[PDB]
Design a protein around this nucleic acid. Sequence first.
RNA 1: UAGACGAACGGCGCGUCUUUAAACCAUGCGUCGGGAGCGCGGCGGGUUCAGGAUGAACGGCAAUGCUGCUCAUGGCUUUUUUGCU
DNA 2: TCACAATTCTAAAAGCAAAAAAGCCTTCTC
DNA 3: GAGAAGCTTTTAGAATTGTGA
Lengths: 248, 49, 149, 83, 1335
Amino acid sequence: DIVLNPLGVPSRMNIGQILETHLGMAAKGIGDKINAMLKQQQEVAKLREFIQRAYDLGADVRQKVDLSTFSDEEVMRLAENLRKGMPIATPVFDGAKEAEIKELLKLGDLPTSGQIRLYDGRTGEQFERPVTVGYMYMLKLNHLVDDKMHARSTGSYSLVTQQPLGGKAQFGGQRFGEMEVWALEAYGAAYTLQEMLTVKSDDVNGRTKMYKNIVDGNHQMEPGMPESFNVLLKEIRSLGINIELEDE
Amino acid sequence: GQNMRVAFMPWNGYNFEDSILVSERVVQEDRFTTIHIQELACVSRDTKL
Amino acid sequence: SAAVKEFFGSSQLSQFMDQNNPLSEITHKRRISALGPGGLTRERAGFEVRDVHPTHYGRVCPIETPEGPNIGLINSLSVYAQTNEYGFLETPYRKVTDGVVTDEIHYLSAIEEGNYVIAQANSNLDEEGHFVEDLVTCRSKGESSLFSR
Amino acid sequence: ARVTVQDAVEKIGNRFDLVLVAARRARQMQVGGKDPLVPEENDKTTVIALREIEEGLINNQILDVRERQEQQEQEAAELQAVT
Amino acid sequence: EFDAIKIALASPDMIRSWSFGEVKKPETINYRTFKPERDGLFCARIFGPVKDYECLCGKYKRLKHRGVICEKCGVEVTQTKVRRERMGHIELASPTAHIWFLKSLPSRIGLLLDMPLRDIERVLYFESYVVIEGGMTNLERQQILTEEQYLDALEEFGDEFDAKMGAEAIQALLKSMDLEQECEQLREELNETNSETKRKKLTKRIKLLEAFVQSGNKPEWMILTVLPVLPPDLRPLVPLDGGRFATSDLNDLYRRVINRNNRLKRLLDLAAPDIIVRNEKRMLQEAVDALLDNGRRGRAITGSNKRPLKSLADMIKGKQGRFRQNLLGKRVDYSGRSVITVGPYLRLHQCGLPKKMALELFKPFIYGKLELRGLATTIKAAKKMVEREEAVVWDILDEVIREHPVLLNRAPTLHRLGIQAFEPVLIEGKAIQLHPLVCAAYNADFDGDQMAVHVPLTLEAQLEARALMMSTNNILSPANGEPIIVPSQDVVLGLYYMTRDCVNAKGEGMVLTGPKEAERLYRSGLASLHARVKVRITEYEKDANGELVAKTSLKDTTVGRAILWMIVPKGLPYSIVNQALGKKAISKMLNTCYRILGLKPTVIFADQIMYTGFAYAARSGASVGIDDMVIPEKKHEIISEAEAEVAEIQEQFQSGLVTAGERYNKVIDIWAAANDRVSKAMMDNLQTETVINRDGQEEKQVSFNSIYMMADSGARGSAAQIRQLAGMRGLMAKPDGSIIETPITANFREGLNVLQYFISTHGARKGLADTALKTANSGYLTRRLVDVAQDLVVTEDDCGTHEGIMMTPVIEGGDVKEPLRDRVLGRVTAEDVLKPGTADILVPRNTLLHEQWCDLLEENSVDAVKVRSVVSCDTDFGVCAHCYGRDLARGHIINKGEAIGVIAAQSIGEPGTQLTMRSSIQVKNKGSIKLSNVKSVVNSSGKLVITSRNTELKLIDEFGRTKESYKVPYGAVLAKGDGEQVAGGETVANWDPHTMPVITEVSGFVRFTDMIDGQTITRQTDELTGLSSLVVLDSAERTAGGKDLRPALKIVDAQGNDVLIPGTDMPAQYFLPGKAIVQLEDGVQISSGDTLARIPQGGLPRVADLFEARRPKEPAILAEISGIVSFGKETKGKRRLVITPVDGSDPYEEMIPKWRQLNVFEGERVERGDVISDGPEAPHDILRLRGVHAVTRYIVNEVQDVYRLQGVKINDKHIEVIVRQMLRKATIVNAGSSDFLEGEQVEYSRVKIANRELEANGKVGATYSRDLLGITKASLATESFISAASFQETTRVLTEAAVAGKRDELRGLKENVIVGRLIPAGTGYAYHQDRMRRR
RNA sequence: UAGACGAACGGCGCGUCUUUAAACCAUGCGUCGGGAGCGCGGCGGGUUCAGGAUGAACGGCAAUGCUGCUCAUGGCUUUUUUGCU
DNA sequence: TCACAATTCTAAAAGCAAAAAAGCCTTCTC
DNA sequence: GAGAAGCTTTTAGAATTGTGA
Ligand SMILES: [Mg+2]
Ligand SMILES: [Zn+2]
Ligand SMILES: [Zn+2]
């Protein structure tokens, strides 16, 4: 159903997932045998004997499940619940051991190595190097791509500084921060930088003219000077300072 | 979550760095389909005029 | 009314419930935070407070804390951890009398844990509750080491 | 079609003059109505200009002399019509 | 349209000239209808109309009325955008002091008057009085009175006594003072200062006064009388959901100040008493000071809940001021985000763009094409057609995308490869498909990262994306030469599995006709992918100039190597495919392909390599199972052995035969040794595990274990990880850093138990906290480098210079850390390279040392080169293309225009996220011996003993290229002589570490000169040995009477006639310090080498401190002049020390502390750059004394040490240019025939060009001493204030510029970025040069 | 049901009254609308002077109008949590 | 006088994005 | 009700004063 990469195991030393894969394969093998019995309709004697064999293997383990007390009617109910794979509890720091995993694999008819032979889906060719297949518990985290995608051509703009709003919630543009500005300066990209600073953020007449030019098959911008800079000039003149743009 | 069947191998670069290659049988069975409930409020106010 | 509503509605420690999973809710309720009104802050936090002290053992989880800025300050409370009448975390141990390991549960706090030698949970026990092998790994003064039976 | 501009760069050895020269030629094609000097292969004006530079028949000198010439012929048309 | 920005102080008349009307009432709006109200903060009469082309009352609305001022209400019908540009003013009833010019530290009103700050502060806030115009009384003007003294003076002195209070008095003082006469008088008095501390104060004050009279300012303009008000539309009262209003905070502050002003006007009108008006003037002062900068006075006034409300300085300052928030970075249109996935089918100039995002970003282009085709006449029809997503819109969208690039960007853009241009391919989905190869450049994995995409609109931006930023141009890094398109992890695993050999595989030992038959054999199944085979392979050498010759032959290869040979282009050999091809091998493959063939073959080759690697990694089926972590079979034996030895040491301690620390060290060492043994056993088992047979007995080969191939290919992991998986994970340190005694003997294949896991958690939490809290430190450092270096650009082809740095291989003392071949690759030679034979030009003196020339140098084995360096370039306002050298990201010389300061800062800063945040000379090899700076004599043993504190040695090969260097202190037992040959492992020298010998060049008897038995010495017999000796003492314990009697000793002959110092005719008086235990008493004929008197004894912040140029806390004091040194007077505060030159004079004297084991005695010489006390050194001293080349080489070496210990590789051009931008000022010593002051600190290029043009005639130039500033000071103390104010210290920078009347011609990158025009760096270089050509 | 008034005019709205201009509000209620330049005059608003709270003149602007010449026809702050480096 | 040195005041502390909630002076009426 | 009147970071640099000779 799903294919992962082996390269994530060595560097990111999480060996727990391979062990979980092996033990899940073993559990699903037990469930597959129970399904085979429960399909080719059998009698409760063989089912209870096999489930007892499954519940009574390992080292000296806490729980003792004896099916002689189950009254033969809920043994079939138990088998129906176990036809999807026998659940297994592996407490945190006193869990199972690879010898127990191999014994549970050998209870089913699975290979103790944990690795089987696979075939290519579109060339019918055997892969070499037996691969590790098994059952792993996958979660679906709440980071959905249809909540992250967002795009904008034009929209509304802030009041004080005539720039695009920011956010997917209020339809808005992307921040072209100062590190991106540096990275554009490190190329020779002076025109890209000028257009992103004037005609796509601030210069109001420039950006209206740019729109009208684009729709008219003409790709050319009128430079203009940003409105944020005028806001800064007024914010500085509101002190005692007198900052002025000199003549041509 | 759901207990899926897994194989640890590369596959034509589609699980290259941390990507995952799912099969169509996972989507046909709706094994990872979720229900989300939004809420939308329309508030009628006492505006001028 | 204004004061109690300010506490419950708009406070740093009275936060919107995390609810998309039973585990998310339950682990949001058992969450300890070193921030808040009367505590330290994310940027003012050093590294000695961002860290796993040896007395966290059995009272605070070492491996459940959010990554990013507030690592180490949003700790989570262990399964058997509890609280004194005075507000200090305590955790349960089994009294080990005369070599035999009985089953009366004493709830020890960090300032009492240092005056005893606490054996380890997975140290083998035989029938009737002796230590099968004649010397065991323990921790006595904030430090692990191997002691006589 | 264009993937790499190294051949275009080799005949204008600055890589910042290439951008301006190709911008001039592409703007001529797009707005000025000039006819491309190479066959169109469903390329855009920028790629057509870069292909022309690769072939070796556009540069700063050629553009300047062509501009001078066409201005001179338009002025000559004015002169003939008026005198 | 404009060329500069002029900043100055605003006159009250100037403020009235900006104004459009004077605000009178605090109120803003009505709340019945939300229109403005007269003379309020929002007033249509003052600040312009509310609606476009309409009058407020409603009288004037026609097109014939644009301009008329209505009489009913006074508004001027016009555009409402005019609200965004009109200022008012407020007429303060009493003058008020501007907070900035008063409390900026330095105070521009304080030092101007010479009054101290706190007195002015008391005077202004109405807490004391101040007199002016003392008259014919004994009271001076600027002194401060107080209430009781004011009363006393007034009762005892009549009307002719002006004593005022508040800002009015400060204004009267400031206005009464004449500037020219004070400047002249104080300059005259400055010449007689005698160089005390006060001199510094004066040269500040004068610098104000002259700078304050050259410009057109007057003092009283620092005191506010009229106050401007911000236009209403910059502090808007936006309505919200309900009847209330979302007001700004500026409105609140203005309301407050207007309230207080109105109250004060009322009280002054109604003849109020003095106390109440005094209080109200104080309160209005506080209100204005809150308005301009809320928080500089006492605790900031809080607006509504708990937050101090923002003032104007807050809206200009900070990380959320206008500069850093809205001018240096913006939000942009035509941009989107989404999650990134992997597309392995793309060519590396492509990306996958969702159809939805493509349609959302390219709407205007689609409208253009729709109206062009006629499919929709009006714009609204096209808009609605696009909104319904018709079937024709998609062919249009596929036509407005063909060759239109888009910029892809990941969140932290650490270097310039975090933005790249791609040609979109439309994709059905919601995630952006990114090529696998470009992921390394972005540092992007596919576990949830997002990416932002931008669209270039204009035609020149499309050309720039296609030419400068396209991903097929950025294959090499700019930080070094190495590629950045090396295959990452699955490709390398596939190529390592494919190009390999098994000692007996299917279809071994058959002969093939070429790669094609190998591939057919493999695919059909008749042979294994890695079986040894003979193949006929034709390879093309392009040795002939522009000509390829096709050699053919039979080669012993594998089937997989033969299959891979098909991809490889023509010019390459077969030696590159005939090995195992790990990761480094593939990197070298791509590098040689690029350097030999070109670009297009390299790009096609990289794509083909990715495809084939992915394909054969799929075919291999390489997995990872539990049985691929093989524990050593001998692990438990080793662990039992080590544990038994540990128990033995514990028993040894229990019996009290050892202490604690040595038990700790024995335990830690034995556990470390056991860990290394287990690791070696594990790796030896793993790597060679497989054993297999060909035709009989079993041979053995390299292991096909999956984890071994993963950690050996270089695909993923390293030996440490395989150690932790299979062998024990060793020893863990607790938070204090003390290594825990008990190791973790369990590995991850087995289980850790609870205690071991707890210790592992200590370590893991420490690491995660370290990274999460060092990201910000790296970001700050990178910001500071960029803001110091950003304005440096390549602007010339040649400075016409011969000076340059001497680059040699760098050796810490062991093996060479990195050769000469790597240092001078792509640098321009400054002075020619001579053939090692004799004085023959080997390569010219302006070559670009590319691979050919460097290999030539290597084969001829040149010791070192002199190369042109950036720091030694005489180009002013930039650098020249030759001193900088090669463009690293490209292959050619650097282009005129390229901005190298930004790229240098990015190269230094990007690897900052990998750094951390929290005997005898045993020779190695056999070669000749050389020494330099050695002063030594022969001893009785026939060895050689050294009398210098800066002695060293080299072991050198048979070719003269040095291999090993060492350092020998004063007085070492040399085991060989200079010029001889030694044997590998032969010890060459040995010393006595803790004792400092006083060895003599002469020999004989001793004289007891000037010792008092009890003060100079205190007898302390060596009790446990039997014999006794004198014990000299220092000056810190003896009585004052004998303190001046310095305890010394002298060597003489038998007759007592003094044996003179060799080389001169003076006795050799060896003065000694305390603890100079003289074991050998008189009567012993000494020998040379005899100890006369025993004298017993970071990470990233390191880089930040090196660039900050922080002086250490224990600097190694240096020497300033040659000649005999001497001690000084008996410790008045500090032990005085004098130097005496031969040619020069000897006034020089230094105040050294008493806590240093000095390196020099009285009878010894020194030199510029010598050490007087060892320890960490200060770069300022290196610049001042040793030179500029010394400091740049020092900083380069000490930064590259940090960056090389972590395995990072940066070129040395970048640190050189940051150094150049640091040492950029200079203080003038001799004014000369120029107009620079005594000690004014001036831009070094300024004085350079000044005296350069001044020496056109025969006049004299000037003399200067260069200063070394940090990166905060080197960037704040610049000549342009727009740059500095946008970086840090906005208030200080703006006050300095305003009082100085400064003028900013833009000339830089950040300045042109703020004002929204073309930067003068890349494609905008031509336009700026054009502008400069029209002036 | 209709008429009138509410800083110039018209429609519409709202408030008040009934042949009358009042009352309400007080940058004298709300929203929308006037093809433009020159010319004529001038509601409204102000300047000067006096007279002794009153009155004469005035033209930079200018409302309902009149004759003639020229022209195309749209959100910010604080807090919290999360995600990727 | 005129020089070190302890105090203390001032500045700075990465980037990008998603969701949610709480708010937008006191007070004085009669 | 609606409308106003008025109690903990850490580092580092630069400016005082507080003895100290
Ligand atoms: Mg990631
Ligand atoms: Zn009006
Ligand atoms: Zn140069």
